Amino acid sequence: AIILGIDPGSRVTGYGVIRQVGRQLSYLGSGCIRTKVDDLPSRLKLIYAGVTEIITQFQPDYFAIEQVFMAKNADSALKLGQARGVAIVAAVNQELPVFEYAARQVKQTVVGIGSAEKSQVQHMVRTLLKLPANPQADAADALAIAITHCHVSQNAMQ
Amino acid sequence: AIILGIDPGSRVTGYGVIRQVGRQLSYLGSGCIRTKVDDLPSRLKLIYAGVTEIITQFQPDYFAIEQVFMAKNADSALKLGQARGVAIVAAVNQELPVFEYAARQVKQTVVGIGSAEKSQVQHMVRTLLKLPANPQADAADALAIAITHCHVSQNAMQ
Numbered sequence: 001a002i003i004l005g006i007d008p009g010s011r012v013t014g015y016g017v018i019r020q021v022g023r024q025l026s027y028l029g030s031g032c033i034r035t036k037v038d039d040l041p042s043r044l045k046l047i048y049a050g051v052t053e054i055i056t057q058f059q060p061d062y063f064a065i066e067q068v069f070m071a072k073n074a075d076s077a078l079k080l081g082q083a084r085g086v087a088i089v090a091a092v093n094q095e096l097p098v099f100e101y102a103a104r105q106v107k108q109t110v111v112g113i114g115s116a117e118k119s120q121v122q123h124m125v126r127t128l129l130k131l132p133a134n135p136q137a138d139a140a141d142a143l144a145i146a147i148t149h150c151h152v153s154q155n156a157m158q
Numbered sequence: 159a160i161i162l163g164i165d166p167g168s169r170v171t172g173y174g175v176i177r178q179v180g181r182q183l184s185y186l187g188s189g190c191i192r193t194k195v196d197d198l199p200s201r202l203k204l205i206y207a208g209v210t211e212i213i214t215q216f217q218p219d220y221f222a223i224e225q226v227f228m229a230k231n232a233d234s235a236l237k238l239g240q241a242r243g244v245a246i247v248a249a250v251n252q253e254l255p256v257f258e259y260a261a262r263q264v265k266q267t268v269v270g271i272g273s274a275e276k277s278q279v280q281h282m283v284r285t286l287l288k289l290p291a292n293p294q295a296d297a298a299d300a301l302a303i304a305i306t307h308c309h310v311s312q313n314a315m316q
Contacts, residue, residue, distance in 0.1 A: 041256040044247050074232040081239015082246075089202050089244050098199045 002028065004060040004096070005146030006051065008087045010079045011036060013047055016143030017058040018129070020150045027129045028058060030139040044086050051090040063091040063098040064149040066106055101148050109148045160186070162218035162254075163304030164209065165297070166242035169194055171205060174301035175216045176287060178308045185287040186216060188297035193241075202244050209248035221249040222307040225258040259306045267309045268302050 005016035014032040018025065033050040035043040054060075065088065071077050091098055108114040111124045122140040126133045129143065159179070165172040171191045177184040191208030193201050213221075223246065229235050249256055265274040268282050280298035284291060286305060 040258070041246055041250050044243055045250045048247055048250075068236060071232055071236055074230050074235050075227070077232045077235040078226060078229065078239040081236040081241075082243025084236070085202055085240030085243040086247050088199060088240070089206055089247065092199055092203045093206070100198070 002058060002060045003062050003064055003146045003149050004054060004058060004091070005064040005142045005144070005149070006087050006091075007066065007142040007145060008047065008080075008083045010076075010083055012137065013050070013083060013087060014137065014139045014142040015051075015054055016139060016141075016146040017054065017060060018143070018146050020154075022154070025128060025147065025150070027131065027143075030143050032137045032139055040082070044082060047083060047086040048090040051087050052094055055091070055094045055096065060096060062149055062153070063088075063096045064145045065091075065098060065100055066145045067100045067102050069102055069104060099149050099152075101145060101152065105152070106145055106148045109151045110144050160217060160219045161222055161304040161307045162212065162216065162220065162249075163222040163224075163300040163302070163307065164245050165300045165303070166205065166223070166238070166245040168201065168237040168241045170295070171208065171241070171245065172295070172297035172300040173209075173212050174297050174299075174304045175212070175218055176301060176304050176308065178311075181312075183287055183305070183308065185289060185301075188301060190295045190297055198240075202240060205241050205244040206248050209245050210252060213249060213252045213254065218254060220307055220311075221246075221254040221256040222303050223256065223258050224264055224303045224306075225260050227260065257307060259303055259310065263310065264302050264306045267306045 002019045007014045012032050012034045016030045017028040019028055035046040037043050088098055104114050107116045107121055110121050121144050125140040125144045161176055163174045174188040175186040177186055193204040195201050195204060246256055262272050266272050269278050279302055283298045283301050
């Protein structure tokens with residue numbers, strides 16, 4: 001009913017927390033963790049301290065994380081991997097269940113087209129959230145993987 | 159006093175603890191945690207536990223991981239990047255100071271040559287830690303990296 005959506009990376013992991021009262025979508029809070037520091041241990045440290053922070057603050061029922069179908073540069077991907085993994089585990093160690101969605105599935109879901117440009121997806125995220133957004137470091141991307149989970153979760157088995 | 163070298167692998171992870179006392183090198187133990195399990199969320203967490211159960215059971219001072227740079231498979235990069243990010247955090251959170259060694263400082267430290275091959279390396283490890291011993295699998299890859307730390311710890315101050 002309360003979903004954390006995390007779009008993690010080398011440099012910064014963004015976050016989107018929202019509730020869903022059956023069909024009444026609702027913005028709770030979003031943001032971007034900034035783990036820029038040179039050192040890995042510590043940058044991995046910050047991902048975790050932050051994520052489990054959000055958890056400990058928003059008290060979320062599910063964990064949404066998107067997946068990788070097109071993850072083309074080898075050494076850029078190792079780093080996504082470590083960022084990925086730490087975020088996942090902080091979630092798991094918090095007892096929250098992790099849900100992996102294909103970016104393919106996140107576009108179809110929000111905007112109705114899986115060939116939609118990122119700003120078309122960001123645009124819909126903020127219409128829907130009625131976000132008086134004057135955007136940033138584009139937290140909407142994490143917000144969007146959040147919406148998705150709902151659609152799917154309230155769509156599966158019948 | 160106590161060094162732990164780790165070899166994080168999505169499917170398997172070797173460890174090697176050694177004891178450095180003065181200039182006296184001593185073998186405490188080694189093995190491999192078999193994190194073979196389908197659900198990604200659990201592999202990870204198994205890495206996390208396994209690595210932590212060794213940290214408490216053995217109680218290292220230091221943590222030593224070998225850096226990963228070249229690889230050119232980007233589906234596997236992301237597969238090795240998660241695990242290795244989960245193994246590092248496991249130690250961050252137990253209050254272990256973590257150090258990375260390039261695959262070539264390791265060869266230079268135990269084999270004398272840089273472009274050595276592992277048969278050599280692993281061959282020479284059993285010697286260092288005077289141990290003509292019965293390889294389960296072969297965690298010899300973690301003992302070498304832990305051995306490196308003991309060397310590149312014993313090097314410039316004065």
